[PDB]
Amino acid sequence: TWGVSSPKNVQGLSGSCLLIPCIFSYPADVPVGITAIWYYDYSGKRQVVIHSGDPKLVDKRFRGRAELMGNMDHKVCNLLLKDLKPEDSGTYNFRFEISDSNRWLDVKGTTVTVTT
Numbered sequence: 446t447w448g449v450s451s452p453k454n455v456q457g458l459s460g461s462c463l464l465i466p467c468i469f470s471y472p473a474d475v476p477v478g479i480t481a482i483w484y485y486d487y488s489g490k491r492q493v494v495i496h497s498g499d500p501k502l503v504d505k506r507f508r509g510r511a512e513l514m515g516n517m518d519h520k521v522c523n524l525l526l527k528d529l530k531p532e533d534s535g536t537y538n539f540r541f542e543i544s545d546s547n548r549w550l551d552v553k554g555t556t557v558t559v560t561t
Contacts, residue, residue, distance in 0.1 A: 449522065449539045449551035456515065457529045457540045459561045464514065467522035469541055479517045480542040483524050486535045487554070493523065494537065526557070534559045 449469040457463040483494040485504075492504035494511045503511075514523035522539050537555045542548040 447549050449541070449549065449553070451529070451539060451555050452549045452550065453553070453556065455467060455555060455557045455560045457526070457533070457557055459529050459559055463526040463557065465524040465526070465537070465538070467515070467524060467539055467555075467557055469520055469539065469549070469551075471543070471547070475543060475547050477543060478538070481515060481517065481522060482542070483513070484538045484540065488536075495503045496524055498542075502532070519526055529557075529559045530542050531559050531561070532558055533557065 449467065451465060455463065467556060481497040484520045485492045485494050486511040492506060493506060494507045495513045496502040497513060508545060510528055511524065511526045514525045515521045521539065536559055538551050540550040
């Protein structure tokens with residue numbers, strides 16, 4: 446079963462760190478490495494928050510602020526967001542890639558809200 450389960454909404458207080466529990470799945474018959482990627486406001490701006498393929502693709506906006514707390518092998522895709530910001534609020538969608546079609550992007554997303 447292909448899918449990325451992760452919280453719909455998340456509460457976060459400015460300047461503090463937030464962790465997003467994430468977990469994804471796919472059919473045991475899919476052969477295999479695994480690439481992880483997080484996104485902010487995909488529809489519009491769509492900025493690379495995390496990239497395990499090339500940390501160089503990460504939007505500067507997040508560099509040094511968001512890291513992947515995942516166990517690619519254990520199918521955990523947790524996202525850690527250090528130092529929140531009111532601007533940081535938005536919708537995050539996770540995408541993992543294996544092989545040209547064995548790629549998947551979570552339609553749901555996780556909406557993080559930042560307050561003081």
